[PDB]
Symmetry: C2
Subunit: 178 residues, 2 copies
C-alpha cells in the first residue's frame, strides 16, 4: 500500500472493488425516482433541489459521524453509550434541521416556486434529522463490527443519507401534491 | 469540544456555521439545474441519474484524497511531487471512470431508457476522471495554503463534486440531446 511504489493498474485494483459496491447502492437511487417520476414531470422544479437536499443531509451525517468517531477513539464514549447518544442527537438534529430548513425555504421563495415551499422545508428538517442519527449510530455499529470507522464511514453515511434523503423528499412531495 | 460534556444547544452552536456555509454552496446546484431546466423538461429521464452520478463522483474524490492525505501525512509524498501525482492519478481515473461507467450504462438499460445510455455513460467517465484529480490535488493545495487538509477536504470535495458533476452531466446532456 505504498502509493509512490504503486502503479496505475495497481491503484485501480484496490480502489475499484470499493467503488463498485457503492455504485450498485447508488443505482437503487435511480429506481426510486421512477415511481415519483410521474410526480417529477408534473412539477419540474423538484429536480433542482434534489442535489442540495441530499448534499446537506450528507454534510450533517459526516459531521456527526466525525464527532462520534473522535470520542470513541479517545474513550470519551464506550459502545454502551449509544442509546444516550441517540436521545441526545435527536435534539441536535432537530435544531440543525429547522435552522438549515429556514435557510433553504428562503431560497425556494426567492426562486419563486410556492408549491415547493412546504415540500422542501419539511423534508430538510426530516433529512437533517434522520441523516444525523444515521451519522452517530454508524460508528457504534462499525466498532461493534470490528471495522475501523474512519475508512468506511464517510462514503457509507453519504450513500445511506442520499437514499434516505430521496425517499422522504419524494414521499412528502407526493403527499402534498396528491 | 468534549462531546460527552457538551449539551444539545451547545452541540448545535458549533455545528451550524459549517453546515450553513455548505448549504449556501449547495444552493448553487439548484440554480445550475434551472438553466438546464430547459434540458430537463425535454427528458424527464435526466433527474434519476443525477444523485448517483454526483454520489459516485463524491466517493471517487474522497477515496483519492484520503490516500493523498495519508501519504502526505506519513511523508510518502512531498508537496513537490504534485505533478507526478497528477499524471499518475489521471490514468487511474480513466480506468475507474471507464469501469464504473460500464456498470451504470447497464443499469440505464435495465431502467429502459436507451437514448440516455450514451449521455449517462459518457458523463460518468468524465465525472470520475475529474473527481479523481480534484481529490488528489485538494490536499496539496490546502497543505500549500497552510491549513490541514483532513478536516476540510471531505466536505469541500463533496460540494465541489456535486457542482462540477452537475455541469458535466447537464452540458453533455445538452450536446447529445439538443
Ligand atoms: Ca454528496
Ligand atoms: Ca417531461
Amino acid at each position: 500500500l505504498v502509493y509512490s511504489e504503486a502503479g496505475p493498474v495497481a491503484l485501480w485494483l484496490a480502489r475499484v472493488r470499493w467503488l463498485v459496491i457503492l455504485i450498485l447502492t447508488g443505482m437503487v437511487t435511480s429506481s426510486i425516482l421512477q415511481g415519483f417520476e410521474s410526480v417529477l414531470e408534473a412539477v419540474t422544479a423538484l429536480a433542482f433541489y434534489v442535489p442540495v437536499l441530499l448534499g446537506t443531509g450528507g454534510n450533517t451525517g459526516n459531521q456527526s459521524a466525525t464527532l462520534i468517531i473522535r470520542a470513541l477513539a479517545t474513550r470519551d464514549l464506550d459502545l454502551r453509550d449509544w442509546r444516550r447518544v441517540f436521545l441526545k442527537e435527536m435534539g441536535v438534529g432537530l435544531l440543525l434541521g429547522l435552522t438549515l430548513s429556514f435557510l433553504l425555504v428562503g431560497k425556494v421563495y426567492w426562486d419563486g416556486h410556492p408549491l415547493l415551499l412546504p415540500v422542501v422545508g419539511v423534508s430538510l428538517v426530516l433529512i437533517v434529522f434522520f441523516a444525523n442519527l444515521v451519522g452517530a449510530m454508524l460508528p457504534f455499529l462499525l466498532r461493534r463490527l470490528g471495522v475501523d470507522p474512519a475508512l468506511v464511514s464517510n462514503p457509507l453515511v453519504a450513500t445511506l443519507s442520499d437514499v434516505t434523503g430521496l425517499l422522504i423528499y419524494l414521499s412528502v412531495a407526493r403527499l402534498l401534491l396528491e
